[PDB]
Structure formats: structure tokens, C-alpha cells
Scaffold this active site. Structure first.
Site, PDB file in Angstrom:
ATOM      1  N   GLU A   1      56.274 -12.529 -10.589  1.00  0.00           N
ATOM      2  CA  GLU A   1      56.774 -11.501 -11.491  1.00  0.00           C
ATOM      3  C   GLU A   1      56.345 -10.279 -10.867  1.00  0.00           C
ATOM      4  O   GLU A   1      55.659  -9.460 -11.538  1.00  0.00           O
ATOM      5  CB  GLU A   1      56.201 -11.674 -12.959  1.00  0.00           C
ATOM      6  CG  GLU A   1      56.340 -12.964 -13.522  1.00  0.00           C
ATOM      7  CD  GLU A   1      57.814 -13.238 -14.282  1.00  0.00           C
ATOM      8  OE1 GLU A   1      58.764 -13.408 -13.162  1.00  0.00           O
ATOM      9  OE2 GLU A   1      58.193 -13.186 -15.329  1.00  0.00           O
TER      10      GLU A   1
ATOM     11  N   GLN B   1      48.010 -15.817  -8.962  1.00  0.00           N
ATOM     12  CA  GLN B   1      47.155 -16.993  -9.209  1.00  0.00           C
ATOM     13  C   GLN B   1      46.473 -17.536  -8.122  1.00  0.00           C
ATOM     14  O   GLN B   1      47.028 -17.562  -6.943  1.00  0.00           O
ATOM     15  CB  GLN B   1      48.264 -18.079  -9.890  1.00  0.00           C
ATOM     16  CG  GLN B   1      48.779 -17.895 -11.092  1.00  0.00           C
ATOM     17  CD  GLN B   1      49.976 -18.644 -11.490  1.00  0.00           C
ATOM     18  OE1 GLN B   1      49.881 -19.707 -10.891  1.00  0.00           O
ATOM     19  NE2 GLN B   1      50.656 -18.262 -12.428  1.00  0.00           N
TER      20      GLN B   1
ATOM     21  N   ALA C   1      36.018 -19.044 -14.755  1.00  0.00           N
ATOM     22  CA  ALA C   1      37.001 -18.380 -14.164  1.00  0.00           C
ATOM     23  C   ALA C   1      36.689 -16.952 -14.681  1.00  0.00           C
ATOM     24  O   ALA C   1      37.047 -16.158 -13.678  1.00  0.00           O
ATOM     25  CB  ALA C   1      38.380 -18.812 -14.676  1.00  0.00           C
TER      26      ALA C   1
ATOM     27  N   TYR D   1      36.657 -13.576 -11.654  1.00  0.00           N
ATOM     28  CA  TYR D   1      37.355 -12.270 -11.884  1.00  0.00           C
ATOM     29  C   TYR D   1      36.692 -11.152 -12.590  1.00  0.00           C
ATOM     30  O   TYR D   1      36.955  -9.883 -11.776  1.00  0.00           O
ATOM     31  CB  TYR D   1      38.604 -12.636 -12.887  1.00  0.00           C
ATOM     32  CG  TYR D   1      39.347 -13.947 -12.316  1.00  0.00           C
ATOM     33  CD1 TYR D   1      39.604 -13.727 -11.107  1.00  0.00           C
ATOM     34  CD2 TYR D   1      39.896 -14.781 -13.017  1.00  0.00           C
ATOM     35  CE1 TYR D   1      40.458 -14.677 -10.364  1.00  0.00           C
ATOM     36  CE2 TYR D   1      40.760 -15.978 -12.638  1.00  0.00           C
ATOM     37  CZ  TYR D   1      41.036 -15.799 -11.188  1.00  0.00           C
ATOM     38  OH  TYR D   1      41.809 -16.892 -10.727  1.00  0.00           O
ATOM     39  N   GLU D   2      36.040 -10.941 -13.486  1.00  0.00           N
ATOM     40  CA  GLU D   2      35.294  -9.966 -13.854  1.00  0.00           C
ATOM     41  C   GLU D   2      34.277  -9.315 -12.786  1.00  0.00           C
ATOM     42  O   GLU D   2      34.284  -7.887 -12.532  1.00  0.00           O
ATOM     43  CB  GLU D   2      34.213 -10.256 -15.047  1.00  0.00           C
ATOM     44  CG  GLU D   2      34.731 -10.309 -16.619  1.00  0.00           C
ATOM     45  CD  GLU D   2      33.730 -10.762 -17.296  1.00  0.00           C
ATOM     46  OE1 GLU D   2      32.704 -10.887 -17.272  1.00  0.00           O
ATOM     47  OE2 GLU D   2      33.945 -10.738 -18.759  1.00  0.00           O
TER      48      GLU D   2
END
Lengths: 169, 172, 172, 168, 168, 169, 168, 169, 172, 169, 168, 172
Positions: L76, L87, L131, L135-136
Site C-alpha cells: 500500500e 510486514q 509483536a 515494534y515499540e
């Protein structure tokens, strides 16, 4: 009489053809493909414009009334044979016209196209159509049993034929 | 004479009606690049399927005031052999005017001065001797008597094949 | 004789090498549906551009044990007129065996018993009289002496056009 | 003994051979062809066409024995032309009787067709007889209808009906 | 009074309007469409497709009255789904009785079909009744089969047979 | 001698052709379209397989060594003329071979193809190429000034020609 | 007086007429044509082709006067064949001198070409003379090069150089 | 048991599918289009590879024997419904396998695909097929009269269905 | 009220001018199935390249007398997830009439009663709080505060993402 | 003034564009492809309607006179740069208009399109064009030597640029 | 030592590897690509395109050493952008000096081009120096022109002229 | 560490088996440019229908000795907004090795140093907090709590949307 003209079929004539089918209440065909609506026919005419298996002619009088249609289908060049078909419009029916057209069709088949044999199909429930072809020298060669589903029932038809040699004598 | 004013212009789509108004008076199976036709619509599409074809070249004749006189056709054209078949048609309303020789000159003059050909042949029905004596007078000469060659109007007929060579047409 | 065992099978792609190994011994401009060629690759693609073409039909001859003998070709085929040109070729290593008449029967027998034709014609060089007397013996007859028709091997040559009709070939 | 199997692309060679022997013009979906390459192309062109349906006959050793064609299938009038070609080698071994019925069986039990008809040369009385004993009946004797092998020959048109087959 | 005529391209606008009103997803030859342009394109795409056949209803002044669709036509099992839409304006004028039969008549006399069936919302008892008196009979009451207007509704599947129609 | 064979060009021959160009350090052409890499050539050969404007031949000896290439380009059927071009491979050069090939090219042009005129282009900086054609009866018909940009500078070329009539006498 | 304008599709009729008169075979991007329809098709086929570039000559009343063609344009060797056709009606009015230069001007100032050359019949000394006074010089007298009007005629090849034009 | 694997359908699997049809002596379908011969199927598979209306799965055991095929056809995303179909190969029949597969199909339909309703068709002449689905919680929603011409006669079929909500409780 | 007479009709080619007369007042990069545009002609062809696309569905609103009111768009549509983005536009000359809620009902009513969806989300600029309180009143609820998501009119801006579920819209 | 409108380019505008080229006596380009005749342009416009590399705008006043054309070409989304070009029609020249349009172009480039850098080319033989851009804050970043063959000679051009950051401060 | 050969399809893998290392977006005929399959497709798409021309560098053992690209070739203005990539393995072996000239030689002797120019990162003074001693001269110092490796970097535009090359 | 040797190479046809061997362990509806798939053959053709698509870019990770580690996807992608979804997938046999952070650096490093993007977002199941914390730790921050967004494994689930900006990833 010699009133009646035959003329090759063009795009303009399709409206006329289509009209010869509404009254008919059976399946209408165009180069072995089935159709009901003008737009199907027109796509079909177009798809088959170069196709040599069938060949059509409009009858018009001296005034250019649409009288009928003479058509030869299943034209086979190896066996030099073709099946012949005729439609006389509702208004121009019962006028003595058939003979003249049969004879003009046989004329073109044998003298122009150089065919060996013209054959046709008549329902057995048309004694006077049958007799008519016989009066134009068609002989019965087959009684085809329950050949076509037309109008609510399987029907039998006569296969009637004339030979190039018989015609030209 | 008034034969002096006849011009040749290459044929185009807008000229097809005229073409198709010339087989209704022929009552013989008209072709287009080796494919028969009857209807105008059959002719139309054939024309379109064959615009880019070198095997045949067609020229429409008009007089000084664009009246449509007749057609000059050239078919079966090797540039290997440099040979072509030629045919002519005059519209009926123009046939009482001895235009033929004149067009036959145009077609010969095209084939040999411009298209650089070697030989031009044509067919003529045995039964059309007026055609024959005319061709003969332009220097055409019989090369074949073709036995039952073309099925025509009820039977098979014999046709004259006739030819003329570039050197003959040209060499004073 | 051993001519009895020669068979005709319709030509196919895998037969093209053999075809192309027959113009190297012809030294004349070979065609394929009215289009010249020299290379095998030129032939290949032409073959492919013409698989669905009714104007010509080709048959390869093999003996009882599939040795490749020669080619039977049929070109320019109206079903209007029901006329065709015919041609024959025998591979050189097989020419000392008088196979010709036999194949010419096969081709005539195809054209008239199966393809239902009316007339079969061929061309033969004026300068090839052995060809002529052979055709003559099968009932072929001269119908034209074509003047400077085909440019061949240095010059333009004259060819015999010869024909036979279905009724003749058939009527006892 | 024998199995009827739908024709695959692998089978064209075998079809094609049945035409050097059988000795007239050969058609696929009404399109003529002489060449194997013509046959092949037409094959793919008509792969989903439902107007014609062909079964190949095999045996135990997987030998190619014969051919059954339904052509001219019409789904309005519920009829189809039927033909059988048995390879010359297996000619007289008495198979056709079965095949013919297996064919009829397909047309009537699986395909829901109402009428099946075929053509047989007058000059082949043996064949006419055989069909007759499979329930086919003459309905036309077409005069000088086919140009076969020199002359315009005569053919019987013969036929059988679903009802008559299923209730025989 | 009324004539049944094969649908032409001129008729799409009229079809298309019957779908702003009728109030669910609209399909042409199983392809969805909302847009007139979608409808038009699909129309040409399926012009010769024999799975579906549509007749438009006209009157004397050549008014566009209704629509008869045979969809899902199957030429093996000889059956087809039938639907009728009458323009809201001409709603209660009592036409359907005839149309329905004229439709049935086509399917059975001209098309040689053996079975015709249709769906009717349970929440529409009036409609069920009407079909019943044209010879349709319930053969299924499909539970929460369609998502119509908020909820998965129940539908009758109803049907009539050629034999029963021709011999009624 | 009569050693040398001419043979029409096939796909296999392309590797050979391509090789005749590396050494050349000028632009290579194929039916008036320019190329450097085998893949360009191959797309080109393919695109022009049916094209009658150009025509090529490989020279091979009795052993089937690749000797050279004779080519006729700009073949014009109305003016019955063509331009002729020859490449003798590096290893087979300076062997007396040119004459034989020129003569075999002229042979095919006039006796087979039936052409009126064959013409060629030679750089003026090739006195002995020039003299050679003259010894095969080519006459100079033009001194084309700064015609081609080849190798760092515009060059002049001779246009030399022979007539069918002169050849065959 | 006169304007040189890029040729548009509207101009084909005018081109086409210049070929009934001019009296040899006519080519578009090397493709022959006799027919207007041939011309038209080829026109679209080569619309972006840069090998050939044509300018039409117009005047005040927007009359179609002439034609300037650069053909055979080569962007490696920076050369092009040049031709001029003036309609017979406007023949002797003395325009060409200018046109020729305007053409040369394009080729040299706008197109960055190094050499321009043209062919002129030997049997047309008048023409040769004219070009000579526009700076063209003979570089070849090609023997029996064109088959024109019965016989293989002789042609001058004449040429001028960018440098010589820009620095003349 | 948990022996049995489901796996999506690939080109390789087509030979297997085709084999599941010979024994069947009825018409075989592929995305509503009818076929008999491998080559028809293969053209069809190909034509429908992107098509979301139908979805198939091969059953394989732990050894990778071909056990059967689970298929969902007429998948409708607006009504969130699909029709389900199962074929157990001749050799692997009568082994207690059906249940497990029905349940795996219902599993995928409701848990993965998020469908509202799965329905099926059984011939009335299959009492024990019928009873089986009922034992997996399918209820009869229709007795469709002379729905299909299979093997010499029009037959009736049961339409049986289960709801997502019933399944997941 | 007069909101009762607003109708929704699926968009078609003849409606494109109106569409294109709505980005000249947006001054933000308008799309068509994920492809930007500025000119009418750019829009035209995009429309044509996307007639058969299920990922977006567009409805034009007209009143009782066919005045063009505004546009209802639905984009990014999984039938896997049964989720869609929704957007609304009212033509300026019609904005003083509180038509918004009414159309938002139409779009929700389409998505959940007819297209059988599960979730409808939209974006709204942080800086457009009038938009927010309106959506909120129809049962929409914030689910994201998207940081510098869309470059808009000079800078990157934050947008509210807001959603409503089918069960909420439906369950009395 | 704020008189002047910018508006996206449509098919109708092509006649106008074409007219802005006759007077120019240099090569005209359309998405890097060269053209002279309306029909070339129109085929080109069409071929490039979906193309994002270039972007154009017609200037029109309040009356809808055609004033000029602003165009951005070589738009690069990775380097967020574009080259900018402007044509003021002959009749509307020398009217103080350029500034306004330059500024409207820079406006759209930076505020709408989100570009990092706009650069342009001016011939060194246009001192007052150069000075003008400098007055709109373009700085010279290159003196490109004999870059273009325009009108009888290779010319030098200035490459001038402004940064998004400089503009917006 | 080294040979310059026209790039073939066989060479794409080698091109493609020069792009995992070289560390920015890679373009073929202005079309971006990351994937080998993207590269391959674009390759065939532009096989005859004359705007770009690439030579691969080989040695005795037929090792793949480097790449020379002329892109942006303009046959009106007679100019082209030039780039050289040498595989990391053969990096410091001192080849470029020659290659660069061989490239220049092609452009000027074989291609008849008037100007060649290239871009070099300011942050790469070593490279600038090298070009300078092959006759390239700075003509632009483009400010924050490329986004390379995090930041908008500065590039020299450098160039040489046919005349200056041929007459040096 | 050994994380230092992981490389990213753009994906190609020969890599599809590996891709397809990663949804059999996902048991969630895998896509390809917004189109679902199950079979390898479905994937194949989709890949082919999408080779020239700029909306998504995929990179396969291999270690120093070409073992296939996992996949980096980017989908996208506006160059208008300069935003992309990202991803990551690691093959199971490689998951006990803490490779994730390393690849997430590669993907961020690609998006911001090379592809010049502004924002990178991803989704993560509410129910997958491992997950989230990962990421954080790379500087990702929650921007949405998406309510019943994706139907997953039996029910609709909530997902975190998380983002990081180019300036953050870059500005020391």
C-alpha cells in the site's frame, strides 16, 4: 410474375428478416447459431459475412415491397449439395408466389452455383406445401421421424430433393 | 477525341458502390483478391481485408467531369515473373462510345511504363469474339485455348488466353 | 509393381526438411501459397502462416518402408470452377525407377474421386519434352503454349499448359 | 473386454491414421483437414465445444481399437449424428454391436438426448443390417447424396429414439 | 393486450430502472453490476450466451411494462430459474398470471425444457399463492438463504414440470 | 575455386554473422535497423524473415568452414536494382576469394533474381578494393562526399555499378 | 509570402493529388501505395516515425502550394534525402528557390543534420541548374538507375553540407 | 483420524480428480462448465485459477495417499453461502472417513471462510448418505423433484443445510 | 423533510463532469481506484479502466427534481473482512441544507442491508471537528488518531479514523 | 494579478499548445518524445494521459483568454524533484505576468505536490530571463556547456534551482 | 587486457548483482526494478530501444568485470549520460581509466555524439579527480539533488566534448 | 552478531515455493497485491499478473550461506503520501534466533534511506503483545486500536496500528 426480384442480403435487410421470425413461434437460426433478438442476429450476420456455407436473397417486387426470403444453407462444396429454405411474408402469402421463387432458387442453385442436388425439409403436417414442391419436381427421399421439437411436440418432416440433371432437361 | 479526357485514378472505399453496381450486370461470380462476393457488405469488408495487398491494383476511370465510366483491374502479379492478368469493365451507359481501346492503352501504359512489367495476359470467352478482335488490334496474341476453364452462366466454357509483352508494346 | 506400394500422406511440419531439400536441386524460385523462399526458416514460418489454407494441398509419397520418395502438390483451387494446378517432384535418388505415372494417378485419383474436381492443369517447360510425353500418356492434352511465362534459369521461357477433365479420367 | 474413454490430445495420431485408410475427406467440428497439424490446431480450437463429443476405444493391453463420434449434437432438438470407425486390424472381431450400444447408452442415459441417427452407404448392406439389430430403422434413402469414390452414392439415414432405447 | 418481445440493447435503461426500485444486488449472466455502464458492457459480453434469455413486455402504445427472465438454463438437466419483475406503475393491473404462462409456454413449447423453478420470499405469501395457481408447487423452504433488507430471509423454491404443464 | 558454396541464411548462421561485426568497429545493420548485440540481431532476423528487401548467403567451402557472407540489400523490384555487400572473414582473407564471390553474387543477381543493376559502396581509402571491383567490371558512377561517419571522421565512398546487360555478354 | 507548416492528416488529399500528376510510384515511409485508403493507413502507421518528415506549403488565402519531404533521415550519419513537389498550378511562379533553403534551414538549423542530397533526372537540366544555385553539387551520375516513363533513366545525385550551408 | 490432511488444489492434482469421475458415470463439472476429458478439465482449471466462486481440497493421509476431494462451489459473498460436495475414492470408501471430512469442510467454511450457511444435495436414493449428514447436523430444507437427469431418469434430491451458528455452539 | 426525497443512483460516465467539478473545490489529490488525477480526460480514462472493479462503488445523489446534490463513495472493500472505507461530498451550492446525516444513512443502509458488510470506517482531518461530531452522532466511534497520515494542503496532517459495525447500526 | 487562473490540461487545450510552438523554431517535446504536427502531439497526449512524469497547466485570465502554459517535467518521486518550464504567449508577453506564474508553479510544486527541489534551464543568452528567476529566488547551480543544439549552434544554459525549504520561509 | 562487448540477455544476472551492492534504486530505460524478473521483462521490452546502450567488460578467462552505460542518448542534441560500475572484487586494479576512454571512444568515434556528461557525488572527490584526468570538466554542482543513503546529497555534473576528445 | 550476515534480496519467481511454504503455517488468508490465494499455482499466476506493480515490494532474507530465513514485505505505497504498510515473517526453523529486530531495521532502512518514505505503519493483533513490545522498541508507536478489523481464525479481532516517521528513524 417476372415482377419479383431476387437480390443479395445486406445489413439493411436484417430488420426485415427479424420480422419474418416473430410470427414463426419456433427457433430462428443464423449459420447454425440460434437467435431471438435483433442484436443477436446482427452480431451473427457480422460474424458470418465471409462465410460460404449459407447464402440468402431478398425477394422484392417492382415497387420494392419486401416479399420474402430465399435461403440456401448447409452448402457443401465437396458433395455439391445445399439445403433450401423459403419464407413468404404474412401479407404476401397465398398469392401464387411460391412457385416462382422455388424456381428462381433452383435456377440460381443449378445454373449459377453449379450444385448437384437441392434438398428441403417440410413438416408432414403441411400436405399442400409438400404437394407444391412435388409440382416443382421435388421427390420425397425421407420421412424423418420426430426430427424437430417445434411447438410443443416432436414432429416428422419430409426430406424432398431435386437433381441438377432433372432440373436441366 | 473525347477518349483523350478519360483519366485513371486508383480505387478507394467510396468507389465500392460503383464496383458493386457492376456485378448485377455481370451475372458471374465477382471476386476480390481470390474471394467471391454478392452483397455490397461482403465487398466492403473484403476491400478492407485487402487494402494492403500488392497482388492486385484497381483504377477507376472518370471523364473530364467525373462521370464514372468503368474499371481497370490488374490481378495475379508476380514481380518474380513480372506478369499480371488484366481485366476491363465499362459501365453500360457508356458502352456505345468506343472507350475500350483507350483504357486498354492506359492499363498497358501503366503496367509497362510505371509498374515495369514484362507480360500482360487476359482471358476472354471463346463466345465473345468482339472482345478478341479488339485485344488482337492492341497487339495481344492468343497463347491458349483453355478448355472448360470457367463455369459461366449454366455451363463450363472455353476461354482464350491472350498476351502481349513489354518489348512489343514499347519497341518502335 | 513396386509402384503399388507408394502411399500418399498429407504433408506436415516434420516433413519440411525434405521439402527444403528439394529446391536446392531445383535452382528455381520455390513458393508456398504464392510466397517465395530460400532458407528452411523462411519455409517453416510460411508453412505456419498457411496450415489452414484451402487453396493448396500437399502429399508426401513414401514407399512401404517409409523412404521419402517425392511430393505431390495441388495449387490454385477454386471450388467455384473446381480447377486446380498440379505439380509433382521425385527425389533424385528415386528417379531411376519410373514412379511418376503412378503418382500422377494418385493425384488425379485424389482430385476427381475425393476432392470432386472438374479439371486439372499443369505447366511444363517447352524445353522439357520428356515431361510432356508423360502427361500426354495419362490423358493430358495441350491447351496453351505460354509465351515467356516464367523467368527461369537466366531467361524467360515458354511453357506448355496441359489439362485433363474429370469426365475423361472417369468415363470408361 | 473393451473400455470407452474420452478422447485426449494423445489420441489424435490414432484418429489421424483412421483417415489415410477410411478414404474420404475428414472433418473436425465441421472444419476440413488433411494434415495432422491442421487436426491438432482444430483440436485446441474446439476443446470446449459441445457440438461434438468423441470416445476412443481401448482394451486390456491399452491398444487403440476404435472411435465413436457424436457430431451435430443439438441441445434444442436433442439429436445427434453418430459414427463408428474400427481400425482395420480389429475389423471382424465382432465388437461394434457393443460399442454402438455403449454409444447409444451415453447419448440416452448420460446426455439426455432424444434421437440418434446415422448414415450408411446403400452399397454397404452388411452395415445396414447390423444397425437394424441394434434398433436403428431407416427413415430416408437419400438419393445421390454423397460423392464417394467416383460417383454420387445413395445413403440410408437410420435412427433410434431414447424412449425406444430405454424402453426396449 | 400485451406482447412479449426479445430484449434488445435499447431495453437496458428500462432493465436498469427496475433495479433502483427492486432494491437488491442486480446480476447479468451471474456478473454483478450497479452502473448502467457495467450493465451495458456485460450485455455485449454475453450477447450469444444461451444460459440466460430475457423477454421484455410491451403494450399497444409500446409502453415498457415488465420483464421475464430465464436464468441458469441447463441444457443437460433441462431446467431454468424463472423471475418476473413488473414495473411498479403497472403493479396491480393483474398481468402476471398471463406473463408467467407465456414464460412457461416458451420454456416448454419452444425451448423443450423439462423443469422450471423460482424463488419467492416467505415474507411474500401473496406471491406464493399466485404461482401456486399457475401450477407451481413448493419443493423447498430454504432457511435463512438470502440476505435481504437486513436479515437472512426464508425462501420457497417452487417448480413446475413440462409434462404437468403441457398435460394440465 | 568451385570449392566455395553459397547457401541461404538460417537462424544457426546468426552467431557467425555477429562474429563478422566485432572486428568491424563500425555500426552493423539489419534491414536498415542498427544492432550490436546478438539478441538485437535475433529479434531483427525474426522480425524480417518474410522481408524481400534484403537477401543473404553464407559462403562455405567443401569442409563447411565459414568463409564469408554475400548480401544484397535495398532490393527494389520496380527499378530492378539492389545494393551488394560482401564480408570475408579475417582468417579467410587475402586468399584470392573475393573475385569468385563477387562473380557468384552477380551470377545470382542477374541469372536468378533478374535484376537490371547491381551497385556497391567502397570507401575511397580502399584503392585495392576499388580496383578489384573494376576488375570484375564495376564502373564508378559516383564519388559520394562525406557520406558516412565511420571511425572518427566523415568518409567519401565510391558508388560502383554493373549492368545485367554488360554482365551477360 | 509563403509558410511552411508540418503536415497534418487533413493534408493527405493534397499529397494524394500530387501523385496522379507526378506520374510514378508513390511511397510513404518506403511503403508503396496507389490508393488514398492505403495512404491514410500508412499515415497513422508511421505517425511517430522519425525517418521521414514532411512540410506542407501554404500561402495567405491558405492555399496548398507545395511539399517538402525529408526522407531516409539517418541519425548516425546525419544525412537525408530531400524532395520538393510544387503543384502544377503554381509551377513557374519562382517559389522553389526559397522553399529549398527553408528546407535546408530546417535540416541544418533545427535538425542538426550534416548532409542533404537529392536526385534529379539527367533529362531535367533546368532542375539541376536550380539546385546548383542553392549550393547543391553533383557527386554521382547514376547510370540507368530509375525506370521512369519507359526507360531506365540517368540521375544526378547532388548534395550540400551543413558546414557549407551555415558558413556560406 | 487426524490422519487425514486437507490441502489446496494444484495442477498436479488434476489427474487424480479426473480419475474420481470415470467411475461416476454422470456429467462432471468444473466451475459450472461440463467436461469428460483431461484436456477439457485442464483448459478449465487454467481458465478458472483466479475464480473465487469455487474452492477445492485434496484429502491425503500421513503417507500421502489420495483419499478424496472436498469442494465448495457456488460460493456467494453477499449471502455468505456455498454448496458443498465430497468425493471419497473407491478404494478408500467405507472406512469411516466421511464424517471427519464433512467436519473439516464445515470447519474451514465457518472458521476460515466466514460463511453463514453450507448446503448440499443428496439423491433421495441414498438413505445412508442422508442419515450421515443428519448425524453431522445437516437438516433437510428441500425435496427437489426430478432436479437432475442422472443415469437414465430424472431424480429427486434432498437439499440439506447447516448454519454457521448451529455449527459453532 | 426534504431530505426524504434525496435518492442514490449508481454513478455512470455521463456523471463524470460533476465528479470533476468537485476536486476544483477540494484542492486535494483526488483518486480513482488508487490512481491520482487532475484533468477531466485523466478521470474519463481511469473511469473506463475501472468500470468492472469491485473494490469501490459510487452513488450520485439527486433530489426529487434531479438536481445534483453530492457523491457517496465506498472504497477498499474486502469481502474477506467485509470492511470498506466510506466518503461523502456535497456540492457547495447544497451545503447549507443539512443533507449529510441523510446520505450517511443511505451509505450505511447500503453497506449493511444490501452489500452485507461488517464494518465501515472513514477518515476525517483532526482539523475538521464538525465532520467528527457528525459521524459521532450517527454512531461512529474513534478507533485511530493517525499521525501525519495524509499530506494535505502544504503539510502532513493527523486524521481521525472512525468506524461503526453492522450489528451496532442494526441491533435495536 | 490574481486575475490569472491555472487549470489542468485537457484535449481541447492541444490546439493552444501546438500554437505555442510554431513561433518557437526549436524542437518541441512531449514526455521526452519529439513532435511538430498536431497529430503527433495528439497521439502523444493520448499515449501519456496516465503518465506521472510530467504535469501541465494552462493559464487563463478572468475572461478565459489563453495566457500561457506552466509545465513540470522529469518529475522524480524518489528524489522529489522536477524540472519546470514556462511559455507565455506572444501577445501576452511583456506584461509583468511571468513572476506570478513562476510563483504559482512553485506554490503548486511545494505546497501541493510536496517536492524538494524545482530546477530550470535558461540559455545564457537570456540575461533578463535569468535575472527574473533570481528575483524569484532561483540560484544558479550549473553552467551547462553546449548542452542543446538550438537554432544553428550548440548553446550553453544555466541550471537554476530553488529548494522547498527556501520557498517556505 | 580487457574487452568491451555488447550486453546480451546472458548478462542480466551480472547486471542484477551490481545492484544489491551499489545500494540505490536501479533503472532500466528509465523504468525502475528491484526484481530480476522485472529486469528481464524490461530487457525484452526495450531490446531495440536506442536511447540506452550497454557494454559489459570481460577479460581473458571470460570473467565479468564491469559495466559501461550510455543512457539518455539524444540524437538531436547528440549527448548522453555516462556511468561506469566496476564489480567490487576488481575495484582497485586500475581499469576505469581505460574503460572510460573506450566508452568515450564509442560515443565519439562510432556513435557521432557531440557531448558526454556524468554525475559524481561531491562526497566522492576520488572519482571527480579521475574523470578530470580523462578530460571531464565540472559544469554544475547540483545542490541537494539526489536522495542517497539518508540525505539529499550534492553532485558534480561533468562533461567532455567530441571535438575536445578527438582533438585532445 | 550472526544477525550481521542476514541480507535482503528482492523476491523473484524461483522464490515462490518458499513464500507458499509460509501460509500453510499462517492459517490466515494470504494475499498478493490485494488478491487472496491458497494453492501454489494461484500464487504463481498472481505473481506474474503483478511483476510490474509499484504498490508492493518484497525482499527475501538469506544468511551468509543462503539459508532462507524469512520475508520482508511492503504494501500500500503512495508516493503522494509516501506511506507504506510493512510486514515481516520469519520461517519457523529460524525463529529461536532473535532475527526480527535486525530485519525490521533493514525494512526501515530501505524505506527511509532508499525509497525515501515519510511513514511506515503496520498491524499487529491485540492478542499478539510480543509483536507489540518489539515494534515499540524500534521506535514504533500506537496510532490506532482497530476494532474488529480483520476476521482471523474463527472471529473478528482487534489490531494495533503502529507507526514510525522518517524524521524519527533518522534524526540523531
Amino acid at each position: 410474375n417476372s415482377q419479383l426480384t431476387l437480390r443479395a442480403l445486406e445489413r439493411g435487410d436484417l430488420r426485415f428478416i427479424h420480422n419474418l421470425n416473430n410470427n414463426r413461434n419456433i427457433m430462428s437460426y443464423w449459420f447454425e447459431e440460434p437467435y431471438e433478438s435483433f442484436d443477436e442476429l446482427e452480431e451473427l450476420y457480422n460474424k458470418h459475412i465471409h462465410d460460404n456455407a449459407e447464402r440468402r436473397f431478398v425477394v422484392e417486387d417492382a415497387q420494392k415491397n419486401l416479399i420474402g426470403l430465399v435461403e440456401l444453407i448447409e452448402i457443401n462444396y465437396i458433395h455439391r449439395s445445399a439445403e433450401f429454405q423459403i419464407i413468404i411474408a404474412p401479407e404476401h402469402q397465398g398469392k401464387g408466389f411460391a412457385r416462382t421463387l422455388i424456381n428462381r432458387a433452383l435456377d440460381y442453385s443449378f445454373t449459377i452455383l453449379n450444385l448437384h442436388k437441392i434438398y428441403l425439409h417440410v413438416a408432414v403436417e403441411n400436405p399442400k406445401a409438400v404437394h407444391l414442391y412435388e409440382e416443382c419436381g421435388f421427390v420425397e427421399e425421407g420421412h424423418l421421424v420426430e426430427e424437430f421439437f417445434i411447438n410443443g411436440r416432436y414432429q416428422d418432416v419430409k426430406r424432398m430433393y431435386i437433381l441438377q440433371s432433372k432440373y436441366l432437361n
